[PDB]
Amino acid sequence: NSNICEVCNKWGRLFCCDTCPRSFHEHCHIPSVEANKNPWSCIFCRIKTIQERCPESQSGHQESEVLMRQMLPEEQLKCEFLLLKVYCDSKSCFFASEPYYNREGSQGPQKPMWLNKVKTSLNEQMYTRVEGFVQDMRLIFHNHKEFYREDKFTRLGIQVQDIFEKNFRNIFAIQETS
Ligand SMILES: [Zn+2]
Ligand SMILES: [Zn+2]
Numbered sequence: 001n002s003n004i005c006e007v008c009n010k011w012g013r014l015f016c017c018d019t020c021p022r023s024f025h026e027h028c029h030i031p032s033v034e035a036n037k038n039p040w041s042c043i044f045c046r047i048k049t050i051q052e053r054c055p056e057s058q059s060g061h062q063e064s065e066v067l068m069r070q071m072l073p074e075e076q077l078k079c080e081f082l083l084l085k086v087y088c089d090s091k092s093c094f095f096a097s098e099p100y101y102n103r104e105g106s107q108g109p110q111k112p113m114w115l116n117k118v119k120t121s122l123n124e125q126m127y128t129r130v131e132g133f134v135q136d137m138r139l140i141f142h143n144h145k146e147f148y149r150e151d152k153f154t155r156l157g158i159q160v161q162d163i164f165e166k167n168f169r170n171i172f173a174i175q176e177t178s
């Protein structure tokens, strides 16, 4: 097993996956690491098993169809993994916790959003469709773009949204296009 958390790349109190070499802090893993379960398989392993059980699940899909899916167990898991993949980028620290807005010449967004809130929402089963999760994720970066305007700090929004979008296309097997 690894000696650092796969998500935040620090040492500490780590839980080890029994079926791959990754390790996690308790609350870096999504969902949080389960109390018992021996053996324990992490989210990367669980996502790999889905693919192996249904190899056709990797054929191309339309984004519009993916968004309308109901949050059954397997879509729930995919959304948790996609959220995890964003937290894996150290630039997610800017979007994790509840933001505030007091900048000359800007007004704050009508509907603030942050990664920990989406985390909570997923954990409490508040999303009924994939569309709900994806809207809130994209709202995070859109609020950032709009508020920071021509400050070069807007680029953090672009960069973390690219991580999100690439991972979304990968995890939900969106049809490749030019
Ligand atoms: Zn960690
Ligand atoms: Zn694993």
Ligand SMILES: [Zn+2]
Residues within 6 Å of the ligand: 053, 054, 055
């Ligand atoms: Zn099958």
